[PDB]
Every structure is written in C-alpha cells, then in structure tokens.
C-alpha cells in the first residue's frame, strides 16, 4: 500500500469540479458525428447578435409587440424621444434582450454596447435625430443641450435606414456588476430631435423606429451565476 494521506476537501462534491469519472457504458460505439449548420462556440457570439429592445414597455404597451415600437411624429418637441439607463442586465427593458439574458447568467461584464436604430417611417419622411450616451456622474440629460455635451451622433434619416450609436466602454472599474449597483453606474442613453421629422402631402404623420442592442468585439462577461429570470414551483415529490 502506497502511503497516502487525505486532505481537506476529501470526499466532497463541488458542482464546479472537473474530474474523471468511470464510464457506466464501456466501449460504447458513439454515433458518427456529422457537420451541422450554425454551430456555436461561445455565448458571447450570441451577445453580438442584434436583438430588439422593449424601449416603450409603458402601461398598455408592455408585454405586447407594441413595446418594441418607438413613437415618432411630425410635431416638433424638445422632449426626449426616449431615455434608457445603461445597465444591460438590470434595467427592466434591457434585461430581457438577448444581450441581457446572457449577461444575466454571469456576474461581471465589460465592453462597448452597440445601439442600432431602424427608422420605419415612410420613404417620404425626412428628419434628423440625435442619439447620445452620457457616462455617469452628473445630472441626467433631460434636455438636448445637455445630451449634446456628451458622446453623441446626429443621425440623418435617409436611404440608409439604420444607424448605430456606440456606448464606448467608459468605466472606472475594469468590470461592471451585472446586478444593479450604484458603484457600477452605467450612464444615460437618450434621444432627441435635431430638427423634426418632416412629411409631405398625404404622408403618415406618425410612425416608429426599432431599437436594437448588441455587444462589440471588445465585450466579455465573467463569473457564471444562475439567472433570476426564471422561476419554478418547488417540485411535488411522492413522500
């Protein structure tokens, strides 16, 4: 008998261990593998896919296709077309996007977020919006003259339907907590009118734009955690 001596952890069962276990089905001639379209290697690949945001999950709109449709019109206001807080896994609206759902299986996240908008008005409607990401620390941008003072882009509606506005990873810590936390503040993404959507004779005076969110190639997430997004009634039994 080779003199051995057991150490702490001996006999425990850590659900994150990576050990060799004997095989209950020896010499099993596995099934010949074949090539299947669209394999996936990393969850982050999915996190880069452009998903739809429920920007307008307001009462009467929530939990209905209508929530994905952002309101836009002919009239000229100086009011935010929308306001979103940069917290990929927290915010009630973002937490449910593909990006969000994934972030929610991890504890920390880093990277730049890509906000892409598709104006769905009539071809005949013109207009210039202004998308903006203002990093945390000051009075949240309620008006345009304040959002314009931070990271922004003046999107001109035209043949190029879509337009992206990126949220350059600007943070103090290298990683941000997925759960909502003040220390790990994200910032403020808003929108305004640079001018005003303008339509002509016989043209739908009100329409929408779709807002998508995706992660940039510098994006990574870490520390596998369980997701809050799903519940389950304590299982029956048989006693």
């Amino acid at each position: 008998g080779l003199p051995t001596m057991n150490t702490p952890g001996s006999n425990q069962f850590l659900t994150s261990d990576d050990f060799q276990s004997p095989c209950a089905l020896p010499n099993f001639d596995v099934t010949p593998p074949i090539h299947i379209p669209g394999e996936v290697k990393n969850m982050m690949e999915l996190a880069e896919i452009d998903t739809l945001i429920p920007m307008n999950a307001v009462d009467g709109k929530v939990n209905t296709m209508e929530m994905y449709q952002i309101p836009l019109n002919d009239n000229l206001s100086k009011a935010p077309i929308f306001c979103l807080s940069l917290s990929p896994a927290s915010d009630k609206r973002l937490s449910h996007t593909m990006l969000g759902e994934i972030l929610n299986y991890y504890t920390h996240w880093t990277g730049s977020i890509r906000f892409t908008f598709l104006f769905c008005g009539s071809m005949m409607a013109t207009g210039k919006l202004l998308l903006s990401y203002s990093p945390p620390g000051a009075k949240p941008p309620t008006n345009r003259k304040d959002a314009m003072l931070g990271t922004h882009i003046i999107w001109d509606l035209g043949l190029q339907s879509s337009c992206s506005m990126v949220a350059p990873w600007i943070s103090n810590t290298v990683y941000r907590r997925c759960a909502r936390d003040d220390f790990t503040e994200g910032g403020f993404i808003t929108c305004f009118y640079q001018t005003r959507i303008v339509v002509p004779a016989s043209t739908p005076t009100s329409m929408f734009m779709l807002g998508f969110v995706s992660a940039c190639p510098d994006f990574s997430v870490r520390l596998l955690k369980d997701t809050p997004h799903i519940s389950q009634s304590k299982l029956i039994g048989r006693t």
């Binding site: 090539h35 299947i36 379209p37 896919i49 452009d50 998903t51 296709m65 994905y68 329409m207």
Partner: protein, 267 residues
Amino acid sequence: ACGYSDRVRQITLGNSTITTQEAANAIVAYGEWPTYINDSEANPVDAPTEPDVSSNRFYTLESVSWKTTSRGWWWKLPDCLKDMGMFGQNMYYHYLGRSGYTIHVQCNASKFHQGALGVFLIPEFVMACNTESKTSYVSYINANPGERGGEFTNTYNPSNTDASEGRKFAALDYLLGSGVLAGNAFVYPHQIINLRTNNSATIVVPYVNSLVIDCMAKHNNWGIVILPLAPLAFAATSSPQVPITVTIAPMCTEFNGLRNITVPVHQ
C-alpha cells in the same frame, strides 16, 4: 461595376425566375449553402433520388394580406409545399427526404406607406398548444396547414373543455407562440422588409437537423414567420391593405426509401 446595385437581383432555379429591384442583399443561413449527403455522412444505403429541376424550383404560395390589424403569419417547410407540383410527389412517395430552400418574401407598397415585416426562418419551430388541460396537444391536421399556413394573434385563450380548440397552436405573437420574446427572434436567419427601404426578402437556407436525412411527412425542419415589427400604415385610409406573397424554392433535394405513396389524414 456597370452599376451592379445591391438592390437589384435575379434568382433562377429550374424553369423559375425571381427578380427584384429593391431588395436588401440576401442572407445565407448560418453562412452555409445547400449541399447533398456526402458518402462519408450518408445513412440510407439505397441509391437516392435527386429530382433536380423537376422539383428544385420556385413554387408560389397563395398571398396573404397585410392589414392594420394583421398580427403575423407562419408556415412550415416542407409542409407548406407538400402539394407543390413535382416536389410533393417525390416528398410523399419516399420515406426519407432532405432539402434546403430559397425563401423569397414579396411585398411592394409605395413611397407613401410605412411598415416593416420581420421575416424569420426558424429551425424546429415548435409552438404551444391551445388548451391548458393537456400538453403538446396538437393534431397533425392543425399542425400542418400547408399553402395556407397559420396566423399569429395577440391573445391567449386556451380551451380546456372544447377539445377541438385545444388541438391547435397558440400563435401568440409577442412570444412566437413558443414562450420566448419575439424581440429576440433575430438570433435566427432573417431579413426585414421595411417598406421605405425594400420590397423583397431573400433567405437561402440549408437543411438543418440532428440527422442527415429525415422523414418529411412527420417533421418540419424550418418554420417561416413574418411579424409586423412596424404596423402597416397609409396616409389615406385607416384601413390600408397590401398583399404579401411567399415564393419558396427547394434545393439539393434527395430522397431514400421508395414505396407506395403517402397520403396523410385530412378533412
């Protein structure tokens, strides 16, 4: 180039040809193109039947109509073609069938309309049944509509009693009738027909399955779904309507296991 627009495009298969002067490129599902079963991946040992032109062409389904009320539509491959010319015959005379397709969704309006259709091609498109008295309770007849395909609604009212209303899909639009927010239906090969931008959608899709070839009469690999991400709209009436046409074309079709023809239950 001589002005080779990304918008203009022609497609040809068999004796059929699509054209479109306003498309937005075309996408090839998961980046792979239709292929045949390679001697190293084969399973059935009988010599396959490869119809080629006789069946790998452009079959056009009965158009549907986009209304301000329209909630969405859906279909199933190969199902929604089981009656399409020669393709069908081969499909039904054989136990095993394999195929990929080129989906072309058409829908023209005018520079004065608004609207945006999300054309998604979902693999293994399983929807929930309409009856909370049973599970996975759907009749073959209802699951396989064919050229007609189904439609999405925005309400969920299961018939726990009436067992003839349970045996059908609960096409809940904001959840793909699957229990997943449609907002993320984009993790599937797709295109968006935004009226102010394009009027066509072209999505080429390769066979997808945990097997090389399968039994078509039992299984629908793909599911085509179209949801108005942006409601149709016209300055004139408050009841605008525009036709949406779906033309599908199978490719690299091959079948194994030939016998008497299959004729499923019907009404």
